[PDB]
Design a protein around this ligand. Structure first.
Ligand SMILES: *[C@@H]1O[C@H](CO)[C@@H](O)[C@H](O)[C@H]1NC(C)=O
Lengths: 48, 50, 49, 50
């Protein structure tokens, strides 16, 4: 089971992480049953 | 499948009648370890794998 | 801390009761700490154990 | 989940993921019923010394 916990916070800090407390609510409990050892995030390009 | 490449199937989002498994005489061995065979119709499960 | 002597007695009694209630959640080497789960999940030969 | 108790209305603001509640003993004290999604408080039945 692959558990995704998520939280959205309105912030106004310019560069680094804000200092505070925010508990992450569980979002998706996912029934995959597969081996995961490596990951990579996906970004979006802007074309002009 | 063969025993080195044994097939694993997930069972989820269904209502299961196990009474047709207990009352069937086709199985030479029907042996349960962590649960009683006759109580399977009275319980709810998740993470079911065959 | 004027009335510490009474408070220690009350805290010790409450803590002993709290530990006694916490002991129900331990399985003591069994498959589960809940009797209802054992009664619903097993036949009497293993249920007695 | 099996047990004995009186099911009453509750004022506990459960979060959407949250289904049941547990006391110090780990016994269920509140539960969310399937099909209707309501939150029912579970209070142990009256007992005492005769
Ligand atoms: C059946 O259960 C689901 C989730 O448990 C719920 O969303 C749905 O409203 C229920 N249907 C009826 C007719 O109660």
């Amino acid at each position: 089971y692959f558990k995704i916990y998520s939280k959205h916070t309105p912030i106004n800090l310019v560069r680094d992480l804000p200092q505070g407390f925010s508990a992450l609510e569980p979002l998706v409990d996912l029934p995959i049953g597969i081996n995961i050892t490596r990951f990579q995030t996906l970004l979006a390009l802007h074309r002009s | 499948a063969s025993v080195y490449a044994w097939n694993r199937k997930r069972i989820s989002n269904c209502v299961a009648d196990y009474s047709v498994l207990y009352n069937s005489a086709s199985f030479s061995t029907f042996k349960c370890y962590g649960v009683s065979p006759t109580k399977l119709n009275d319980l709810c499960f998740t993470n079911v794998y065959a | 801390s004027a009335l510490g002597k009474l408070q220690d007695v009350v805290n010790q009694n409450a803590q002993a009761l709290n530990t006694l209630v916490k002991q129900l959640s331990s399985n003591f080497g069994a498959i589960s700490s809940v009797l209802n789960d054992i009664l619903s999940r097993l036949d009497p030969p293993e249920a007695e154990v | 989940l099996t047990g004995t108790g009186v099911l009453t209305e509750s004022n506990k603001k459960f979060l959407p993921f949250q289904q049941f509640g547990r006391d110090i003993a780990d016994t269920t004290d509140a539960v969310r019923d399937p099909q209707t999604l309501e939150i029912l408080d579970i209070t142990p039945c009256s007992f005492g010394g005769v």
